[PDB]
Subunit: 475 residues, 4 copies
Amino acid sequence: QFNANILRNGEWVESRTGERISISAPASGVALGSIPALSQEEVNDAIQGAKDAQKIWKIRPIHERVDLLYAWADLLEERKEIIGELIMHEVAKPKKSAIGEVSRTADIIRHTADEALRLNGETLKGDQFKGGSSKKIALVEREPLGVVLAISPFNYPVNLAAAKIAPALVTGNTVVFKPATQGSLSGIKMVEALADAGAPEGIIQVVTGRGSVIGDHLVEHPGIDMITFTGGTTTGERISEKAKMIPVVLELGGKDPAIVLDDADLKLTASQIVSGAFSYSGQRCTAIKRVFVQDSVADQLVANIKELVEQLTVGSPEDDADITPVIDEKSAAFIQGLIDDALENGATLLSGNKRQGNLLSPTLLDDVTPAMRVAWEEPFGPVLPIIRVKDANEAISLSNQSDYGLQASIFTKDTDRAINIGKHLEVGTVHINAKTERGPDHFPFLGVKKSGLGVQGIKPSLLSMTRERVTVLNL
Amino acid sequence: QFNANILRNGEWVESRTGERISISAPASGVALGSIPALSQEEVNDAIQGAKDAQKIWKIRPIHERVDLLYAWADLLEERKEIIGELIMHEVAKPKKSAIGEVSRTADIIRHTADEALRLNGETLKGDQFKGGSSKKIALVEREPLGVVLAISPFNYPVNLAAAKIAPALVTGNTVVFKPATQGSLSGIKMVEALADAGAPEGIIQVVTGRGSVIGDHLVEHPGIDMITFTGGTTTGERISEKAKMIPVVLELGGKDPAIVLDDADLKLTASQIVSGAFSYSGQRCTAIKRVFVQDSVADQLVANIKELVEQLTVGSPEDDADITPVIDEKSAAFIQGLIDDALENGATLLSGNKRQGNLLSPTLLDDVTPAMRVAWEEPFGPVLPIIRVKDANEAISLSNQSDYGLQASIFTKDTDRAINIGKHLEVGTVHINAKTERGPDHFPFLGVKKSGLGVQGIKPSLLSMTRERVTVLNLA
Amino acid sequence: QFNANILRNGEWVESRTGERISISAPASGVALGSIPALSQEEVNDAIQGAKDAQKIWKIRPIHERVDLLYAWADLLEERKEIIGELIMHEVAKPKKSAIGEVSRTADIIRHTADEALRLNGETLKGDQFKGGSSKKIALVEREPLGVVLAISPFNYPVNLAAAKIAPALVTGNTVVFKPATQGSLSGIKMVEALADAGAPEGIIQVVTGRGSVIGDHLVEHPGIDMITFTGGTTTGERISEKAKMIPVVLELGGKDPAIVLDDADLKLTASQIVSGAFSYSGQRCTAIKRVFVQDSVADQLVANIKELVEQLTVGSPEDDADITPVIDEKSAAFIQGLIDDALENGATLLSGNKRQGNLLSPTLLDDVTPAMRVAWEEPFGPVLPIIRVKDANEAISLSNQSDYGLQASIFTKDTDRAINIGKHLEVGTVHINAKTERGPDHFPFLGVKKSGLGVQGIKPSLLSMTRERVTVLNL
Amino acid sequence: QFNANILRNGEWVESRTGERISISAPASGVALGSIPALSQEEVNDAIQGAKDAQKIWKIRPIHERVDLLYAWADLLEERKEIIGELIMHEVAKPKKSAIGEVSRTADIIRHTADEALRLNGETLKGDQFKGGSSKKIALVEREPLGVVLAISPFNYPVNLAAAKIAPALVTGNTVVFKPATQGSLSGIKMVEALADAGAPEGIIQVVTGRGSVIGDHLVEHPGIDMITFTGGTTTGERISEKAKMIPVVLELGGKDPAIVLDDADLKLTASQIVSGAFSYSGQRCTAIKRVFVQDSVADQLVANIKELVEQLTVGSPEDDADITPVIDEKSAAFIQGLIDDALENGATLLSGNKRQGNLLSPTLLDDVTPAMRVAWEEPFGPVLPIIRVKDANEAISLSNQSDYGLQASIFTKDTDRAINIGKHLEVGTVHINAKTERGPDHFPFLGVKKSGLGVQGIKPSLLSMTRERVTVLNLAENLY
């Protein structure tokens, strides 16, 4: 029973009122712990402290900021089981991958620290541009922005927090961290590790509380020099709308399509599709959520997908099931309504439409069409629609008609064609003969259209949290 | 005179509203031309044509996009006398500097084309990260954002129009171009060259009209995928507040300080200061606008500066005077409040606080204090305040107190000292023993705090108007 | 006749010894002109001259050195027709291909100019390394090595002369330029254009003469700080063995294989192969010289190849014949030998074992084996051997069994497999579904094993012409 | 008490021919152990093993190549004290500095590993060059060269050995390792840690032997695709001369000048000068070995320098003396002759000529002239000349007259001028207001003129270990 406190200027404190928010395991209903519900004034307190501390943190030598990240990473890898079991219970993530998230987070932090140590500067002579004549040399370097607001999702309460926090701190920014409420105990345990590593006072502040007590206030605060957000599209749009005069990075929803051509390896395709679509029960922005399959191979493809779906284990997070309960009641009803609309409008159900409360069985729908909601709306749940298609050009048209633009998969033996087709897809990343995915973490990661704003991935993140400082000398 | 049309979908037209906005020459108050006053509906057409044309434009091989920039620049350079004369008249820019603007524009266009040509992609192996597959390979390239809204100011109505347009187009975007109303005719003439150079239909659209009609409408339009703005801080902040879900780039106002220490070369310093401050009669975002001088050398530096300020010729743009008339009545009056507020508070007038209409003499003010408006407020006029300072630590503080953070200058024999002082100034670019300035145009250019957002210069312009496209190949 | 002089310290002179070497056209035997045969002491004069001029040239601002290159490129382009006719005559190169050499040379010169202008330095903080810790900053810029000896081949007397001179000069070096005797008139005309454009005195020095008199002397000279050479492997090894304490760049012989798999478009394959193998009658280091074709498609491919080879126009340079006379008497007899050896051991002559003095019929040999010389030795003439092979695996082994490692081509619709096969071939560049080639000239160009040393191409060449200069500040 | 074996093909073996070479502490003459003196065959055998393992190693996922480095670094750090102690005895290096060599070594190996992870490829399009094809794409990557011959000095027998081996293996080359014979025990112990870290068989081979029975044969071997060498200039020369058709990287001798102008902080200068010149008794390629000092300030600086020099302790490596014995008899004899000639040509002895066998007092000479050998010849010993100069201009000239060109120092409060001056100096690196040094190791390191060939430091090392690998694809043009 973790009745967690929050971190402000180096000490672990409670809200002044004493008010708290209750957290329970999605799979069980069982009381897990509580977090402080913070007021606007304590938000102000945390931000001011981070600004203050940023002035002493930026001036530290890079290798010192690098060593804190490495010590923090080591402690997470040390506490892999403990933190892992808390993620499992807190967001109903299957055991091994709750542990796997913590391992990967320590890997992301280390790589980020090492990358920061290799942000070389550059020098430019004045006469490299016509009319500049050569007496002056510019020293270009990178400078932190100040105070980074980092907002993480329930999805990956450790990974997608640390993926933000680590580049901000290592480049000499300070961080105000606002975890998703569900995922906040997990997030707090991650930060406890940072504090135990010796994070100086104020370098990282944790802020918890309801979406409408402190949300806009945080986003509109003149002390915030940068926002990175992962989460729902709606919230992200609102954040963009309300934010003023600062860089903002957004990673939002996805409706990633897998395009399947008739020359495809249909056994590889089915495997990658089922893997990418049903991971963490479909609760992921980056995941295959749409299949566009050419007519001639559809029947064999579907029959392959049906077989693997029916092997997936349904049950408890603790039992390491493939398909675990969804995050809450409200989510379950949403996926349900999508399933309903499909079947009403004449979809073939090949597998599923079964549940016990939040625990939904894996659902496979065939003969899905554009008239169906499940063809566009991100379910964030374990449902996969198949849309039969005439050729590549129809797959592209429907793919691009999505408000979404995160990732796309293209399955085909002909790699040259796949490349050409990918160029016509409005997505951040196209995967050839492979499921969509965020990592490996050094690759650029980004959504366009309503799937995001800015760029993440290890090095792009470092860049987004800094700016050019030019020094001009006369030689 | 020049009753201009605007470009939409490769055709030159006037407004369906039947309305025009009259443009006058600021030096004479005589009519020069006019532009269409478009409707929000004409803005939609422009934006829609731009989006359609982008789908075709973006598929063009790079060398073809690069070849259009070259054709454009050659025609510009070729018409430099004609366009220069129109700038000169439209914005009261000294004759040789207006022609020089076009020269610089043609150069900026070519360098941008040159740089876009040498944009290489990158490959990354999985397992360049622990413990990625190996034989998974990402190919990363730059992809255009879509439709770029470029908004330019009156003071460089070609240079700062083309600096936005050339990187957008060459990287595969299309552009909706909104010039400052004053400077519109110069902007249209620059676009004519681009059209004569053979720009395909819809890749560049020109929008003109009343702020109350089209301003917020452009910045809030869902078909705009990026905004790049140069202009006043207040407008910039408003653009930022109102836009959503897209990148925004802003170069805004500045109040560049020049810190002059005990050991400075006071002749080079005076010279650099006056050149930087009074260029185009101070109507520049990047310009020394504040002098913090160690009181020890203050009397000497002020006698050097006064000499050079009285050296500046004052007169008409056609005569190539150093000081020409300010952009308008409103501007002249604003500068006047600043000067008057300073004297009213006991600052010392060293050189002319005199006017004829909107042509003001260059004004030097000594004994300025943190209590006077002109200590902080960007005049956009020919006035220079001098503030006496205890030491390097007082100038650093007074510098940083400003809302602005564009550039600064440090004048001292002690390079080592200047570098560490520069470190403590919240600015984009610190110049040692030289004036502030935007170029050379390959240097990164940026303001921090209220001075800007995002970054400019040739290569950072190219980055700002694109995004990573990743294609991951499976080789297993 | 064009009785050329050479350049030294700004003036065009003949040799003090009064001697000269005659140059006649390889196609018609007509006297074209002559060059001075310099002494070792005139060579010393050239190098001392270049040395002194460099101290002065290196201190020019970069923008002035690019402008010289621009003026030179503009002059060569204006002289396309004139310099182009000399080349076709001097080295029996087809008229359109000879004029194209000049156009391309100008492009190379400008692109090399443009790229030198945007070479920027880097800065490094001491704290980017454990320890370091502070206000130590390294300013890493680039410095010219000194005097460059550029040695060019017969086959591209202007292209491959200027591709060495242009990057050396632009980066602050001076050049001692040694053209092939056969190709020297064309070389010297390219230099006339440099000098007419305002090249400072001693910046560019031309040396001509007998190999037995000047060759080893040039290569072993203490005043030479860098050598770049293109020519035969044997001569190249002698350079490498004899030079000392200096960077040496070599591009030597090739035996580029074309590997043709089962699934290849045999029409596109035949066309790429013939075009590459028989361009300039095979007198090219980069050129398909071996075909390894899988048994199943060999009949068809060899039919496709035969058809295209018989279409080849064979005759005069002025007539833009596909196949024109090979460089000299030695060359043609050596090629006859290779053809002769193959025939005497069981190879099948598909097309053209016809000789007309130095004018050689394109020769296509089928059923070639490992026991035949022509499977291995570079002919530098219009002969192509087809080797029939079991599979990819056998193709790779026979490819790598060559002493040469220049380039290779892979023909297959399986792009993924082609890439993987490419990784197992020991060559600089692998071309998938296209012929081997040096250009486009921004592409790095290099051979490994006996094919070469170091790297060429626009940027790699610039790099090879300079070294790092570090300045470390301590604040 | 260390009769060491060599590594070939995963097994720690001995010479079949059975011969060894005994190694002795230079400070003592007391035995330390022996190394095997190898034959021409056992040397080919090592080269072949490396070539066969090259084809297995090079295709290992890059992350697997870096994990081996990390592991090796950890084990070295762990064996700080054991390895460090061997170094202080074997090459007579002050105790804490020898352990420091092992610490820094693991630091170089880790940073090299991470740097390899970041060697990204590039793509070029055909139409980036006039007339080029828009449907051509070149994928450019880096490929190992093959088997790399690493030849390290007595100088730094762990540090300058690993600085060559690490970048080589992590970029997918294999190594034939030849330590300086004096230093071979420390290098063997270094290699042991790599083996115990899990190095696959063949990737690293250790070749030991006299230095002629193996010397030329190695450098001339067609099985070698790259040479990297640190040592004497004369040896470097021979290698460049005798090798053909491969890249050759050389780190050779220096005569780094210290330039001291009128407006200099003479306390900091004096301290930087002494720390750098006399570090490891002057047995460093990178070290101040010449002071050009302006006349108006000469007396005061040379007064300061005298003081710090008399503060230097003299004795054995175990005691952590500043000045320990020089490597051998030959070297000390040669150093003595440089002092003699200088005194013989009338140089003022400012302090400590004194020498008892191997151990030499730090020696300070003043009024040193261009006619004296010690103004030019790298002594590799605890001797430092002062050259009284008129200006920077004379300092620049006399500086550039040396055949050497490694590094240099300028001392001044006038930073811009120092930057100007440094530019006329024919060296790889100029240090402003600080001593010359190789580090920090991410900094590019090179000697020009007779001081070397090619470039080192962490990244530049990786590039010298590889070559471009280009794959050109045809981009499909349309569909639709």
